[PDB]
Amino acid sequence: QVTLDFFQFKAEAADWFKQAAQEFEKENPDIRININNLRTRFVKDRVPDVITFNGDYSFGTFAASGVFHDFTDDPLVSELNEGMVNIAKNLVQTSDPAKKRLYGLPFAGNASGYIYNKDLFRKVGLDPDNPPQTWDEFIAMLKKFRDAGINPVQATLADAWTTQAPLASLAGTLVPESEYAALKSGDTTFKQIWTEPIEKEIELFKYADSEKGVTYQQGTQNFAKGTAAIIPLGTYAIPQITMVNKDIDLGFAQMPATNDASKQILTAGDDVILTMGANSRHKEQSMRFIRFLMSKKQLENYADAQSAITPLKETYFGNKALEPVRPFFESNRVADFCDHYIPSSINIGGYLQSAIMSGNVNQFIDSMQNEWNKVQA
Ligand SMILES: OC[C@H]1O[C@H](OC[C@H]2O[C@H](O[C@]3(CO)O[C@H](CO)[C@@H](O)[C@@H]3O)[C@H](O)[C@@H](O)[C@@H]2O)[C@H](O)[C@@H](O)[C@H]1O
Ligand SMILES: [Cl-]
Ligand SMILES: [Cl-]
Ligand SMILES: [Mg+2]
Ligand SMILES: [Mg+2]
Ligand SMILES: [Mg+2]
Ligand SMILES: [Mg+2]
Ligand SMILES: [Mg+2]
Ligand SMILES: [Mg+2]
Ligand SMILES: [Mg+2]
C-alpha cells in the first residue's frame, strides 16, 4: 500500500482529475492518490510523484534542472502527436542540443485566439461558422457589435496572466519563433518584434466597453451570461464558461493579426504535460497511474470535458466549438506561445496589464528589453 502525491496545476480541471484518480483507486487497491490542486514544493526530498504542469518556460527550467523523470524512450511516446512531443522537448531550457530530451508526456493541447457567442453573431447577421479572416475584418466585427449595442470584448485584466493570451495569439502570426534566437543573440530587439503585437492588443481592448479590471472568473461569468460578443482567451477557458451556462452556443476562432488572409497562424501549445518526479520513491505505481491517464479513453474523456485537443497521432477535438480552427491544425499552420521564450523572472503579465491600461508602448518595450538584457548577461 502506497500513497502518491499528485500535484495538479490546472484549476479548471480539478474535478476531472479528482474523479479520474478515484476511478484508478477503485481498480488499484494498492495505490492511494492524494491530490494537491513552486521550487519549494519541488525540492527532491518532497517532490510530488505525479505532476501536471503547463507546457511553458517554467516547465522547461524544471526539466533542465532534473526535477522530472526522463520519458524519452518510454513506450507511450510513439502513439503521440510528434509535434506536441517536439514542443515539450524544445521547451527544455538548455543551450545543448543533446539535452532537449522529453521530461513529460503531452496530455492535452490548447489554442489561443478568441471565444465568441454564436447567438450574438447571428443577432448582428454574422456567420458564426466563418469568423473574420483578417485584422481589418476582425476590427470591423468589433465595431459592428458596439454599433448594435453589444459589448464587443470582455477583458479580465485583474488576472494578469489573461493579458498574455491576445499577445500570444497575435504574435503567432506576426513573429516567427526564430526571432527569439535572434533576440537572445542581440540581432533583434523587442522594439522590432513586439511593437506591432502590443499596438494591436491595445487596439483590441479599446473595444472592451465594460470595466476592464475584472477577474478571470468574473469575465467568464459575464460572457456565459451573454453580455459580450467575444472573450479573447484560449481553449482552456471554454469549460469555465460552460460550467456557468450549459446552453451558451460558443465558437472558437483564430485572432487574425494581419490583412494577409493566406498567411494566418494559430498559436497552439501543450496545455498539460503529465510527468513524474525524478526522485519519486514510488515510480512503478506512479507510472501505472500515468499509463491509465494516457489511454485513448481517458484522453478523449478529458478532451470532451475540457474542450481540449488530444495528444494522440489521430487528433481528437473535444468540442465542436473548435471547428473554425481545425484547418490550422490540419495544415500545420501553428506556432508555440511567444511567452514560452520569456524567462519566468520577467513580469510580462504585470507589464502587459500596464500597457493595456495606459497605452504606453514605449514603457512596455523598454521594460521587456531591459529585463531581458540583464537575464542574458
Ligand atoms: O495566454 C495565456 C497562457 O496560455 C497558456 O497557458 C494556459 C494555462 O493558463 C492558465 O494557467 C495559469 C493560471 O494562473 O497560468 C499559467 C500559465 O501562464 C499556469 O501555470 C497557471 O495555471 C489557465 O488557468 C490554464 O487552464 C491554462 O492551461 C500558455 O502556455 C501560457 O504561457 C500563457 O500564454
Ligand atoms: Cl504525428
Ligand atoms: Cl475530432
Ligand atoms: Mg510526497
Ligand atoms: Mg473553476
Ligand atoms: Mg534545435
Ligand atoms: Mg480587407
Ligand atoms: Mg452603445
Ligand atoms: Mg513558425
Ligand atoms: Mg468606451
Coordinates of C-alpha atoms and ligand atoms in Angstrom, one line a residue:
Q1 CA 0.0 0.0 0.0
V2 CA 1.4 3.4 -1.1
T3 CA 0.2 7.0 -1.2
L4 CA 1.2 9.1 -4.2
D5 CA 1.3 12.8 -4.1
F6 CA -0.3 14.2 -7.2
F7 CA 0.4 17.9 -7.9
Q8 CA -2.3 19.1 -10.4
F9 CA -1.7 22.6 -11.7
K10 CA -4.9 23.3 -13.6
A11 CA -7.7 25.0 -11.8
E12 CA -10.3 24.4 -14.5
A13 CA -9.8 20.6 -14.4
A14 CA -9.8 20.0 -10.7
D15 CA -12.9 17.8 -10.7
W16 CA -11.9 15.8 -13.7
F17 CA -8.6 14.8 -12.2
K18 CA -10.3 14.1 -8.8
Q19 CA -12.7 11.7 -10.4
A20 CA -10.0 10.1 -12.6
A21 CA -7.9 9.5 -9.5
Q22 CA -10.8 8.0 -7.7
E23 CA -11.6 5.7 -10.6
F24 CA -8.0 4.5 -10.7
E25 CA -8.0 3.9 -6.9
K26 CA -11.1 1.7 -7.2
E27 CA -9.2 -0.6 -9.7
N28 CA -5.9 -0.5 -7.9
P29 CA -6.4 -1.0 -4.2
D30 CA -2.6 -1.0 -3.5
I31 CA -2.4 2.7 -4.5
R32 CA -3.9 5.8 -2.9
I33 CA -3.7 9.2 -4.6
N34 CA -3.5 12.4 -2.6
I35 CA -4.2 15.4 -4.9
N36 CA -2.9 18.9 -4.2
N37 CA -4.5 21.5 -6.5
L38 CA 6.9 26.5 -6.8
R39 CA 10.6 25.3 -6.4
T40 CA 9.9 24.7 -2.7
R41 CA 7.2 22.2 -3.5
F42 CA 9.7 20.5 -5.9
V43 CA 12.7 20.1 -3.6
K44 CA 14.0 16.5 -4.3
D45 CA 13.1 15.1 -0.9
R46 CA 9.5 16.1 -1.2
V47 CA 8.9 16.1 -5.0
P48 CA 5.3 15.0 -5.9
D49 CA 5.1 11.6 -7.5
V50 CA 2.7 12.6 -10.3
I51 CA 2.6 16.1 -11.7
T52 CA 0.6 18.1 -14.3
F53 CA 2.2 21.3 -15.4
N54 CA 1.5 23.8 -18.2
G55 CA 3.9 23.4 -21.1
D56 CA 5.8 26.7 -20.7
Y57 CA 9.2 28.2 -19.8
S58 CA 8.8 27.2 -16.1
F59 CA 8.3 23.6 -17.2
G60 CA 11.4 23.8 -19.3
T61 CA 13.5 25.2 -16.5
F62 CA 12.4 22.4 -14.0
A63 CA 13.1 19.9 -16.8
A64 CA 16.6 21.2 -17.4
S65 CA 17.3 21.1 -13.7
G66 CA 16.4 17.4 -13.4
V67 CA 13.2 17.6 -11.4
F68 CA 11.2 15.4 -13.8
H69 CA 11.6 11.8 -15.0
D70 CA 13.1 11.3 -18.4
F71 CA 10.4 9.9 -20.7
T72 CA 12.4 10.0 -23.9
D73 CA 12.4 6.2 -24.5
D74 CA 9.0 5.5 -23.0
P75 CA 6.8 3.1 -25.0
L76 CA 3.9 5.6 -24.6
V77 CA 5.7 8.2 -26.8
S78 CA 5.3 6.5 -30.2
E79 CA 1.5 6.9 -30.2
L80 CA 1.6 10.7 -29.6
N81 CA 1.5 13.6 -32.0
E82 CA 5.1 14.2 -32.8
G83 CA 4.6 18.0 -33.0
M84 CA 3.4 18.0 -29.4
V85 CA 6.2 15.8 -28.3
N86 CA 8.7 18.1 -30.0
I87 CA 7.2 21.1 -28.4
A88 CA 7.8 19.5 -25.0
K89 CA 11.4 18.6 -25.8
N90 CA 12.1 22.1 -27.2
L91 CA 10.9 23.8 -24.0
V92 CA 13.9 22.4 -22.1
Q93 CA 15.9 25.4 -21.1
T94 CA 19.4 24.3 -22.2
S95 CA 21.9 25.5 -24.9
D96 CA 23.0 21.9 -25.6
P97 CA 21.0 20.3 -28.4
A98 CA 21.5 16.9 -27.0
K99 CA 19.8 17.9 -23.7
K100 CA 16.5 18.7 -25.3
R101 CA 15.0 15.4 -24.0
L102 CA 11.5 14.5 -23.1
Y103 CA 10.7 15.3 -19.4
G104 CA 6.9 14.7 -19.5
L105 CA 4.1 13.4 -21.8
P106 CA 1.9 15.8 -23.6
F107 CA -1.6 15.2 -22.2
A108 CA -3.7 17.9 -23.8
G109 CA -3.3 20.7 -26.3
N110 CA -4.8 24.2 -26.4
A111 CA -5.0 27.0 -28.9
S112 CA -5.1 30.8 -28.3
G113 CA -7.5 33.1 -30.0
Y114 CA -10.9 34.1 -29.0
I115 CA -14.1 32.5 -27.8
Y116 CA -17.3 34.0 -29.3
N117 CA -21.0 33.9 -28.8
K118 CA -22.7 32.4 -31.9
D119 CA -26.1 33.8 -30.9
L120 CA -24.7 37.3 -30.8
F121 CA -23.0 36.7 -34.1
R122 CA -26.5 35.7 -35.5
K123 CA -28.1 38.7 -33.9
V124 CA -26.0 41.1 -35.9
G125 CA -26.0 39.0 -39.1
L126 CA -22.5 37.5 -39.0
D127 CA -21.9 33.9 -40.0
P128 CA -20.8 32.0 -36.8
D129 CA -19.2 29.2 -38.9
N130 CA -16.9 31.7 -40.7
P131 CA -15.3 34.1 -38.3
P132 CA -13.1 37.1 -39.5
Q133 CA -10.1 36.1 -41.7
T134 CA -8.2 39.4 -41.5
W135 CA -7.3 42.0 -38.9
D136 CA -9.5 44.6 -40.7
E137 CA -12.5 42.2 -40.7
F138 CA -11.9 41.4 -37.0
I139 CA -11.9 45.0 -36.0
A140 CA -14.9 45.7 -38.2
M141 CA -16.7 42.9 -36.4
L142 CA -16.0 44.5 -33.0
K143 CA -17.2 47.9 -34.3
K144 CA -20.4 46.2 -35.6
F145 CA -21.1 44.8 -32.2
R146 CA -20.5 48.2 -30.5
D147 CA -22.8 49.9 -33.0
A148 CA -25.5 47.4 -32.4
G149 CA -25.4 48.0 -28.6
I150 CA -23.4 44.9 -27.7
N151 CA -20.2 45.0 -25.6
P152 CA -17.6 43.6 -28.1
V153 CA -14.9 42.4 -25.8
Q154 CA -14.8 41.0 -22.3
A155 CA -11.5 41.8 -20.6
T156 CA -10.2 40.1 -17.5
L157 CA -7.3 42.3 -16.5
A158 CA -7.4 41.8 -12.8
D159 CA -5.9 38.4 -13.5
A160 CA -2.7 39.4 -15.2
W161 CA -1.9 36.1 -17.0
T162 CA -5.0 36.6 -19.1
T163 CA -3.4 39.6 -20.9
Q164 CA -0.8 37.2 -22.3
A165 CA -3.4 35.5 -24.4
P166 CA -4.0 38.2 -27.0
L167 CA -0.3 38.9 -27.2
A168 CA 0.4 35.3 -27.9
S169 CA -2.4 35.0 -30.4
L170 CA -1.2 38.0 -32.4
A171 CA 2.5 37.2 -32.1
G172 CA 1.8 33.7 -33.5
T173 CA 1.2 35.2 -36.9
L174 CA 3.4 38.3 -36.6
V175 CA 6.6 36.9 -35.0
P176 CA 8.3 33.7 -36.2
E177 CA 9.8 31.6 -33.4
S178 CA 13.2 32.0 -34.9
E179 CA 13.2 35.7 -33.9
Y180 CA 13.6 34.7 -30.2
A181 CA 17.0 33.2 -31.0
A182 CA 17.9 36.5 -32.8
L183 CA 16.7 38.3 -29.7
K184 CA 18.9 36.3 -27.4
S185 CA 22.0 37.0 -29.6
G186 CA 21.1 40.7 -29.9
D187 CA 20.4 40.6 -33.6
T188 CA 16.9 42.0 -33.0
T189 CA 15.0 43.7 -30.2
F190 CA 11.6 43.8 -28.6
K191 CA 11.0 47.2 -30.3
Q192 CA 11.4 45.5 -33.7
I193 CA 9.4 42.4 -33.0
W194 CA 6.7 43.2 -30.4
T195 CA 5.7 46.8 -31.2
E196 CA 3.0 45.7 -33.6
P197 CA 1.6 42.9 -31.4
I198 CA 1.3 45.2 -28.4
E199 CA -0.2 48.0 -30.5
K200 CA -2.8 45.6 -31.8
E201 CA -3.5 44.2 -28.3
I202 CA -4.1 47.8 -27.1
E203 CA -6.4 48.3 -30.0
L204 CA -8.3 45.1 -29.2
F205 CA -9.0 46.3 -25.7
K206 CA -10.3 49.7 -26.8
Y207 CA -13.4 47.6 -27.8
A208 CA -13.8 46.4 -24.2
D209 CA -16.8 48.6 -23.4
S210 CA -17.3 47.3 -19.8
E211 CA -14.9 47.5 -16.8
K212 CA -11.5 46.0 -17.8
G213 CA -10.1 45.3 -14.3
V214 CA -12.3 42.3 -13.5
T215 CA -11.2 38.8 -12.7
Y216 CA -11.0 35.8 -15.0
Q217 CA -13.9 34.2 -13.1
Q218 CA -16.0 37.4 -13.4
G219 CA -15.3 37.8 -17.1
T220 CA -16.1 34.2 -17.9
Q221 CA -19.3 34.5 -15.9
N222 CA -20.2 37.7 -17.8
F223 CA -19.5 36.0 -21.1
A224 CA -21.6 33.0 -20.1
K225 CA -24.5 35.2 -19.3
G226 CA -24.5 36.7 -22.8
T227 CA -23.1 40.2 -22.1
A228 CA -20.1 40.2 -24.5
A229 CA -19.6 39.1 -28.1
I230 CA -16.0 37.8 -27.6
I231 CA -13.7 36.9 -24.8
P232 CA -10.1 36.8 -26.1
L233 CA -8.8 33.8 -24.2
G234 CA -7.7 30.3 -25.4
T235 CA -9.5 27.0 -25.4
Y236 CA -8.7 26.3 -21.8
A237 CA -11.3 28.9 -20.8
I238 CA -14.2 27.1 -22.5
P239 CA -15.1 24.7 -19.7
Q240 CA -15.1 27.6 -17.2
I241 CA -17.7 29.4 -19.3
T242 CA -19.9 26.3 -20.0
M243 CA -20.0 25.3 -16.3
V244 CA -21.9 28.6 -15.7
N245 CA -24.2 28.2 -18.6
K246 CA -24.7 24.8 -20.3
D247 CA -26.8 26.4 -23.0
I248 CA -24.4 29.0 -24.4
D249 CA -23.6 28.4 -28.1
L250 CA -19.8 29.0 -28.4
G251 CA -17.3 29.2 -31.1
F252 CA -13.5 29.4 -31.0
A253 CA -11.5 31.3 -33.6
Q254 CA -8.0 32.3 -34.6
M255 CA -7.4 36.0 -34.0
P256 CA -6.2 37.3 -37.3
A257 CA -3.2 39.6 -36.8
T258 CA -2.7 41.0 -40.4
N259 CA -4.5 41.6 -43.6
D260 CA -2.8 38.6 -45.3
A261 CA -5.6 36.1 -45.0
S262 CA -3.5 33.4 -46.6
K263 CA -0.7 33.5 -44.0
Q264 CA -2.5 33.4 -40.7
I265 CA -1.1 31.1 -38.0
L266 CA -2.7 29.7 -34.9
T267 CA -0.9 29.8 -31.6
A268 CA -1.2 26.3 -30.0
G269 CA 0.8 24.6 -27.3
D270 CA 1.0 21.8 -24.8
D271 CA -1.6 22.9 -22.3
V272 CA -1.0 20.0 -19.9
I273 CA 2.2 18.0 -19.6
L274 CA 1.9 14.9 -17.4
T275 CA 5.1 13.9 -15.6
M276 CA 6.7 12.1 -12.6
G277 CA 9.1 13.4 -10.0
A278 CA 12.6 12.1 -10.9
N279 CA 13.3 11.3 -7.3
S280 CA 9.9 9.7 -6.6
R281 CA 10.1 6.7 -4.2
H282 CA 7.1 5.1 -6.0
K283 CA 7.9 5.2 -9.6
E284 CA 6.2 1.9 -10.6
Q285 CA 2.9 2.9 -9.0
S286 CA 3.2 6.4 -10.4
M287 CA 3.7 5.1 -13.9
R288 CA 0.7 2.8 -13.5
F289 CA -1.4 5.9 -12.9
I290 CA 0.2 7.8 -15.8
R291 CA -0.5 4.9 -18.2
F292 CA -4.1 5.0 -17.0
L293 CA -4.4 8.7 -17.7
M294 CA -2.7 8.3 -21.1
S295 CA -5.1 5.7 -22.5
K296 CA -7.2 6.9 -25.5
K297 CA -10.4 6.5 -23.5
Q298 CA -9.2 8.8 -20.7
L299 CA -7.5 11.3 -23.1
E300 CA -10.7 11.7 -25.1
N301 CA -12.9 11.8 -22.0
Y302 CA -10.7 14.7 -20.7
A303 CA -10.8 16.4 -24.1
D304 CA -14.6 16.4 -24.1
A305 CA -14.8 17.7 -20.5
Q306 CA -12.2 20.4 -21.1
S307 CA -12.8 21.3 -24.8
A308 CA -9.2 20.3 -25.4
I309 CA -7.2 18.7 -28.2
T310 CA -5.9 15.2 -27.6
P311 CA -2.1 14.4 -27.9
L312 CA -2.6 11.2 -29.9
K313 CA -1.4 10.9 -33.5
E314 CA -5.0 10.9 -34.6
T315 CA -6.1 14.2 -33.1
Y316 CA -9.4 14.4 -31.4
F317 CA -11.1 17.8 -30.8
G318 CA -13.2 17.8 -27.6
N319 CA -15.8 20.4 -28.7
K320 CA -17.5 21.3 -32.0
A321 CA -16.7 24.9 -31.0
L322 CA -13.1 24.2 -32.2
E323 CA -14.3 23.6 -35.8
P324 CA -13.2 27.0 -37.1
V325 CA -9.5 26.3 -36.3
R326 CA -9.4 22.7 -37.5
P327 CA -7.7 23.8 -40.8
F328 CA -4.8 25.3 -38.9
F329 CA -4.0 22.0 -37.3
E330 CA -4.5 20.0 -40.5
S331 CA -2.1 22.3 -42.4
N332 CA 0.4 22.7 -39.5
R333 CA -0.1 26.5 -39.6
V334 CA 0.6 26.6 -35.8
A335 CA 3.1 28.2 -33.5
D336 CA 4.1 27.9 -29.9
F337 CA 3.4 30.7 -27.5
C338 CA 5.7 33.7 -27.6
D339 CA 5.9 33.8 -23.8
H340 CA 7.5 30.4 -23.7
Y341 CA 10.7 32.2 -24.7
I342 CA 10.4 34.7 -21.9
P343 CA 12.1 33.8 -18.5
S344 CA 9.7 33.4 -15.6
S345 CA 11.7 36.1 -13.7
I346 CA 10.4 38.7 -16.1
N347 CA 7.0 40.0 -15.1
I348 CA 5.4 40.1 -18.5
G349 CA 1.9 39.8 -17.1
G350 CA 2.3 42.9 -15.0
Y351 CA 4.0 44.8 -17.8
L352 CA 1.1 43.9 -20.2
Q353 CA -1.6 44.9 -17.7
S354 CA 0.1 48.3 -17.5
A355 CA 0.5 48.6 -21.3
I356 CA -3.2 47.8 -22.0
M357 CA -4.5 50.2 -19.4
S358 CA -2.0 53.1 -20.0
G359 CA -1.4 52.7 -23.8
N360 CA 2.3 53.3 -23.1
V361 CA 4.0 51.1 -25.6
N362 CA 7.5 52.6 -25.2
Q363 CA 7.5 51.8 -21.5
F364 CA 6.4 48.2 -22.1
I365 CA 9.0 47.6 -24.8
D366 CA 11.8 49.2 -22.7
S367 CA 10.7 47.2 -19.6
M368 CA 10.9 43.9 -21.5
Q369 CA 14.2 44.8 -23.2
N370 CA 16.0 45.9 -20.1
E371 CA 14.9 42.9 -18.1
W372 CA 15.8 40.6 -21.0
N373 CA 19.2 42.2 -21.3
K374 CA 20.0 41.6 -17.7
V375 CA 19.0 37.9 -17.9
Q376 CA 21.1 37.3 -20.9
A377 CA 24.0 39.0 -19.2
Ligands
LIG1 O1 -2.1 33.1 -22.9 C1 -2.2 32.7 -21.5 C2 -1.3 31.5 -21.2 O2 -1.8 30.4 -22.1 C3 -1.0 29.2 -21.9 O3 -1.2 28.6 -20.6 C4 -2.6 28.1 -20.4 C5 -2.9 27.9 -19.0 O4 -3.1 29.3 -18.4 C6 -3.8 29.3 -17.1 O5 -2.9 28.8 -16.1 C7 -2.2 29.6 -15.1 C8 -3.3 30.4 -14.4 O6 -2.6 31.1 -13.4 O7 -1.4 30.4 -15.9 C9 0.0 29.7 -16.0 C10 0.4 29.6 -17.5 O8 0.7 31.0 -17.9 C11 -0.2 28.4 -15.5 O9 0.9 27.9 -14.8 C12 -1.4 28.7 -14.4 O10 -2.1 27.5 -14.0 C13 -5.1 28.6 -17.2 O11 -5.8 28.7 -16.0 C14 -4.8 27.2 -17.5 O12 -6.0 26.4 -17.6 C15 -4.1 27.0 -18.8 O13 -3.7 25.7 -19.0 C16 0.4 29.4 -22.2 O14 1.1 28.2 -22.0 C17 0.9 30.4 -21.2 O15 2.3 30.6 -21.5 C18 0.2 31.7 -21.3 O16 0.4 32.3 -22.6
CL2 CL 2.4 12.7 -35.6
CL3 CL -12.3 15.3 -33.7
MG4 MG 5.3 13.2 -1.2
MG5 MG -13.4 26.5 -11.8
MG6 MG 17.0 22.8 -32.3
MG7 MG -10.0 43.6 -46.2
MG8 MG -23.5 51.9 -27.4
MG9 MG 7.0 29.2 -37.1
MG10 MG -15.6 53.3 -24.0

